[PDB]
Design a protein around this motif. Structure first.
Motif, PDB file in Angstrom:
ATOM      1  N   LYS C   1      -6.856   0.330  13.016  1.00  0.00           N
ATOM      2  CA  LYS C   1      -5.834  -0.596  12.547  1.00  0.00           C
ATOM      3  C   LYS C   1      -5.470  -0.401  11.082  1.00  0.00           C
ATOM      4  O   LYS C   1      -6.288  -0.720  10.208  1.00  0.00           O
ATOM      5  N   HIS C   2      -4.276   0.073  10.804  1.00  0.00           N
ATOM      6  CA  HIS C   2      -3.744   0.163   9.449  1.00  0.00           C
ATOM      7  C   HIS C   2      -3.378  -1.206   8.917  1.00  0.00           C
ATOM      8  O   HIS C   2      -3.011  -2.073   9.718  1.00  0.00           O
ATOM      9  N   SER C   3      -3.497  -1.350   7.602  1.00  0.00           N
ATOM     10  CA  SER C   3      -3.098  -2.623   6.996  1.00  0.00           C
ATOM     11  C   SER C   3      -2.263  -2.386   5.743  1.00  0.00           C
ATOM     12  O   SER C   3      -2.253  -1.301   5.106  1.00  0.00           O
ATOM     13  N   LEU C   4      -1.530  -3.436   5.416  1.00  0.00           N
ATOM     14  CA  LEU C   4      -0.685  -3.448   4.212  1.00  0.00           C
ATOM     15  C   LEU C   4      -1.553  -3.570   2.970  1.00  0.00           C
ATOM     16  O   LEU C   4      -2.208  -4.626   2.808  1.00  0.00           O
ATOM     17  N   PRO C   5      -1.586  -2.556   2.123  1.00  0.00           N
ATOM     18  CA  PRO C   5      -2.419  -2.650   0.904  1.00  0.00           C
ATOM     19  C   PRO C   5      -1.855  -3.689  -0.045  1.00  0.00           C
ATOM     20  O   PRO C   5      -0.632  -3.761  -0.182  1.00  0.00           O
ATOM     21  N   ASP C   6      -2.687  -4.478  -0.729  1.00  0.00           N
ATOM     22  CA  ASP C   6      -2.168  -5.347  -1.794  1.00  0.00           C
ATOM     23  C   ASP C   6      -1.535  -4.501  -2.891  1.00  0.00           C
ATOM     24  O   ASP C   6      -1.994  -3.366  -3.093  1.00  0.00           O
ATOM     25  N   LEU C   7      -0.533  -5.028  -3.581  1.00  0.00           N
ATOM     26  CA  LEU C   7      -0.044  -4.311  -4.756  1.00  0.00           C
ATOM     27  C   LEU C   7      -1.085  -4.372  -5.870  1.00  0.00           C
ATOM     28  O   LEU C   7      -1.879  -5.336  -5.906  1.00  0.00           O
ATOM     29  N   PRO C   8      -1.083  -3.392  -6.764  1.00  0.00           N
ATOM     30  CA  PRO C   8      -2.000  -3.426  -7.905  1.00  0.00           C
ATOM     31  C   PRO C   8      -1.549  -4.401  -9.000  1.00  0.00           C
ATOM     32  O   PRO C   8      -2.233  -4.420 -10.039  1.00  0.00           O
ATOM     33  N   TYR C   9      -0.463  -5.127  -8.818  1.00  0.00           N
ATOM     34  CA  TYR C   9       0.124  -6.004  -9.839  1.00  0.00           C
ATOM     35  C   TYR C   9       0.940  -7.078  -9.129  1.00  0.00           C
ATOM     36  O   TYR C   9       1.226  -6.915  -7.926  1.00  0.00           O
ATOM     37  N   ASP C  10       1.331  -8.146  -9.807  1.00  0.00           N
ATOM     38  CA  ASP C  10       2.180  -9.164  -9.183  1.00  0.00           C
ATOM     39  C   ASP C  10       3.599  -8.671  -8.938  1.00  0.00           C
ATOM     40  O   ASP C  10       4.051  -7.709  -9.550  1.00  0.00           O
ATOM     41  N   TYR C  11       4.356  -9.346  -8.059  1.00  0.00           N
ATOM     42  CA  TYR C  11       5.729  -8.960  -7.787  1.00  0.00           C
ATOM     43  C   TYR C  11       6.648  -8.859  -8.989  1.00  0.00           C
ATOM     44  O   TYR C  11       7.571  -8.026  -8.963  1.00  0.00           O
ATOM     45  N   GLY C  12       6.479  -9.653 -10.045  1.00  0.00           N
ATOM     46  CA  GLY C  12       7.398  -9.525 -11.172  1.00  0.00           C
ATOM     47  C   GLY C  12       6.759  -8.670 -12.254  1.00  0.00           C
ATOM     48  O   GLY C  12       7.197  -8.676 -13.414  1.00  0.00           O
ATOM     49  N   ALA C  13       5.707  -7.903 -11.969  1.00  0.00           N
ATOM     50  CA  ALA C  13       5.045  -7.129 -13.016  1.00  0.00           C
ATOM     51  C   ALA C  13       5.910  -6.022 -13.603  1.00  0.00           C
ATOM     52  O   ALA C  13       5.642  -5.508 -14.699  1.00  0.00           O
ATOM     53  N   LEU C  14       6.936  -5.625 -12.865  1.00  0.00           N
ATOM     54  CA  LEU C  14       7.703  -4.453 -13.310  1.00  0.00           C
ATOM     55  C   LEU C  14       9.062  -4.813 -13.874  1.00  0.00           C
ATOM     56  O   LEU C  14       9.921  -3.937 -14.108  1.00  0.00           O
ATOM     57  N   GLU C  15       9.292  -6.092 -14.122  1.00  0.00           N
ATOM     58  CA  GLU C  15      10.509  -6.565 -14.767  1.00  0.00           C
ATOM     59  C   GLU C  15      10.614  -5.991 -16.169  1.00  0.00           C
ATOM     60  O   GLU C  15       9.605  -5.790 -16.858  1.00  0.00           O
ATOM     61  N   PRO C  16      11.819  -5.746 -16.643  1.00  0.00           N
ATOM     62  CA  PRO C  16      13.048  -5.947 -15.910  1.00  0.00           C
ATOM     63  C   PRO C  16      13.502  -4.680 -15.184  1.00  0.00           C
ATOM     64  O   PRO C  16      14.645  -4.683 -14.722  1.00  0.00           O
ATOM     65  N   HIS C  17      12.652  -3.663 -15.107  1.00  0.00           N
ATOM     66  CA  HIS C  17      13.049  -2.379 -14.538  1.00  0.00           C
ATOM     67  C   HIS C  17      13.221  -2.440 -13.039  1.00  0.00           C
ATOM     68  O   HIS C  17      14.173  -1.900 -12.467  1.00  0.00           O
ATOM     69  N   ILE C  18      12.283  -3.069 -12.339  1.00  0.00           N
ATOM     70  CA  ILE C  18      12.440  -3.310 -10.906  1.00  0.00           C
ATOM     71  C   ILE C  18      12.131  -4.794 -10.701  1.00  0.00           C
ATOM     72  O   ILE C  18      11.020  -5.217 -11.003  1.00  0.00           O
ATOM     73  N   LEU C  38       3.661   1.123  12.964  1.00  0.00           N
ATOM     74  CA  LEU C  38       2.724   2.261  13.078  1.00  0.00           C
ATOM     75  C   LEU C  38       1.562   1.884  13.983  1.00  0.00           C
ATOM     76  O   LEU C  38       1.193   2.659  14.859  1.00  0.00           O
ATOM     77  N   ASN C  39       0.947   0.703  13.817  1.00  0.00           N
ATOM     78  CA  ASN C  39      -0.175   0.306  14.653  1.00  0.00           C
ATOM     79  C   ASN C  39       0.247   0.292  16.118  1.00  0.00           C
ATOM     80  O   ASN C  39      -0.455   0.805  17.010  1.00  0.00           O
ATOM     81  N   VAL C  40       1.415  -0.303  16.389  1.00  0.00           N
ATOM     82  CA  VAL C  40       1.856  -0.344  17.785  1.00  0.00           C
ATOM     83  C   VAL C  40       2.121   1.040  18.368  1.00  0.00           C
ATOM     84  O   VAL C  40       1.793   1.321  19.525  1.00  0.00           O
ATOM     85  N   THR C  41       2.727   1.918  17.557  1.00  0.00           N
ATOM     86  CA  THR C  41       3.103   3.251  18.015  1.00  0.00           C
ATOM     87  C   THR C  41       1.847   4.097  18.258  1.00  0.00           C
ATOM     88  O   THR C  41       1.771   4.854  19.241  1.00  0.00           O
ATOM     89  N   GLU C  42       0.868   3.946  17.345  1.00  0.00           N
ATOM     90  CA  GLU C  42      -0.383   4.677  17.518  1.00  0.00           C
ATOM     91  C   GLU C  42      -1.074   4.277  18.809  1.00  0.00           C
ATOM     92  O   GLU C  42      -1.587   5.113  19.545  1.00  0.00           O
TER      93      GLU C  42
END
Ligand SMILES: [Mn+2]
Ligand SMILES: [Mn+2]
Ligand SMILES: [Mn+2]
Ligand SMILES: [Mn+2]
Lengths: 198, 198, 198, 198
Positions: C1-18, C38-42
């Motif tokens: 089972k693959h899982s969604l990795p946590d980001l290494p930073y919060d969602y607004g960590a890359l402001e104002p660039h992204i 992917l899990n379903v397809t595998e």
């Protein structure tokens, strides 16, 4: 030399199904860039063709297909939409949809599925197969145009590039697809259909 | 008008490594067909251009790439072979091959593997990357030509379409590849390289 | 089972660039969908493989490449970004960039050009060519992953799908590319590079 | 474990239309290599799945499609030919051919055109579209199998790889196609068709 067509309606005319910013960007920036790049590429192609430079001709093919296909596709797309659209077609076109897909609702299911099914950028199409004399649904990647790559005559196209819906619907392409049926210009699709049988 | 180039040698000149029947068919039927079809396609593209018919332009792309590509690729191939060939290159090209692949034999292994790795029809290439200023091996499918599709300058091409070897080597493409090193025209390959070190 | 990795930073960590809206949609919706599919397809692939159903295996390949590819590529991309990034890399990675591309500035221009050059959806990559022992720039379409489709080891990827930038930069993909240089995590690119000296 | 099926006839049974050397090589070398490469690739895939190695899974796709497709396609092809074949089908299959293509002779023109039309290696197919409930002609590149890549159920396939005809017909693919009509096993094609409407 090619020119960008005026929409048949104002940028906010398809609200709330497709918002005004999308229409303005889509027409004045995306389709515009297709036209401008197509004119530039065609001019380069003519020079290469005149000099018999086959390598240059082949190197220009991706830009010609992408921008030429974007101009073909977007041009049809604007005419396939209307602020007074929605509902169902009538007459011979409705008869053929029933013939070929079973029912209008089955047809909608299948175009929706083909459109949702594009992985990456592309288009879903209802086309006319002149050889078989019937309707046919097809999907095309990127800006590959329906008739130039499959021979099918286009009747109704659904743009499923993210720029066609992202500002409003974000990742939820099926909500865009549900909404777009409300603005399909069946009078235009009908006219395209009838022109295939003359 | 494109024309079928004359070979630099007789149909039998590459025996026993490439038999005369293959050379005669390869040149007088396969390449000839690419030339004849390319001329027809370029005429049709000029008409499409003159009309602004972008659909017709895009629909002609597969024949232009295939037959234009086959003309580009076969024309280079003939010049890459010689009855007086074989052995190893010298001077700057040899030094370039040692610099970029380690040794002449390592290079041979890598071009062999790229040629053997084509699944279906295609070509293996030694090319020159102008941006990086070094040699590069690439494989290409069908008749897609190296420079028009990758930007690399072709120096040495190995045709691995079945028509290039099947009458003699049958399914055993590696036997063909081992044989062809005996007829490589390194003088031509060196001229192409130096024209890259322009 | 693959899982969604946590980001290494919060969602607004890359402001104002992204901006934070893109980061939250990109991670929690787009990458999440790749992981689930992917899990379903595998699992479906496993079933097919146990039955020796070759047709079923081949029908699943598009979904596996797309969603498998999306999981690989997005997972690398989050690690390639940082609020404490930007500027030029330190250490041997910069020396390799100068060697292979002439200068940092020229490298930026070339990866920007590869990323701008993608027609439709896809990725620009800085990779490592283990056979040649040097850096290499490549573009990949849709979610095709670099290593599984080209053999290059990914070091730095730039997502140029429209969802990666459209809400903030609209159609102006080069403004997005200019901005992302401010948040490159060169520590991560260096870790990936050092793991290739192998 | 996949296995190489015996031919339903001797290598010389399709003379003079397809000669004994072609049949022997085509089966004992080409198809045989597909079966072992398929089995080996399936075992590698099992290991990659068990490890969750998505890169490895994607890198094995070209070998799985090429060799699994080759196994699927060649297995059907041998059953589609017969020393007792030729002529025209009867019953529902002929009526479907008339309905969908106009006549048996127009059908032959259309499958010939599709098969002649393959540029490079590939196959021409008569298939069944289960969604539409009718026949459909399609071409596939390389060894891409019909059902796994298009959804259509294969009824009759025509191999137009050069190894399928070159030893006998050389570059004249149209002469191979004219000849093969004399050995089509319409009983098998009919069996395949009737199984589509079970
Ligand atoms: Mn669009
Ligand atoms: Mn050739
Ligand atoms: Mn993305
Ligand atoms: Mn075959």
């Amino acid at each position: 030399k090619h020119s960008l067509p005026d929409l048949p309606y104002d940028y906010g005319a398809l609200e709330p199904h497709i918002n005004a910013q999308i229409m303005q960007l889509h027409h004045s920036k995306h389709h515009a860039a297709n036209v401008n790049n197509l004119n530039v590429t065609e001019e380069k192609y003519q020079e290469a063709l005149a000099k018999g430079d086959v390598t240059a001709q082949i190197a220009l093919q991706p830009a010609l297909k992408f921008n030429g296909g974007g101009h073909i596709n977007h041009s049809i797309f604007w005419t396939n939409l209307s602020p007074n659209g929605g509902g169902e077609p009538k007459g011979e076109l409705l008869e053929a949809i029933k013939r070929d897909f079973g029912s209008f609702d089955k047809f909608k299911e299948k175009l929706t599925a083909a459109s949702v099914g594009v992985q990456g950028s592309g288009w879903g199409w209802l086309g006319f197969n002149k050889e078989r004399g019937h309707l046919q649904i097809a999907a095309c990647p990127n800006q590959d145009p329906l008739q130039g790559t499959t021979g099918l005559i286009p009747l109704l196209g659904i743009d499923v590039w993210e720029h066609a819906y992202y500002l409003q619907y974000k990742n939820v392409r099926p909500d865009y697809l549900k909404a777009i049926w409300n603005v399909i210009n069946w009078e235009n699709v009908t006219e395209r259909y009838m022109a295939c049988k003359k």
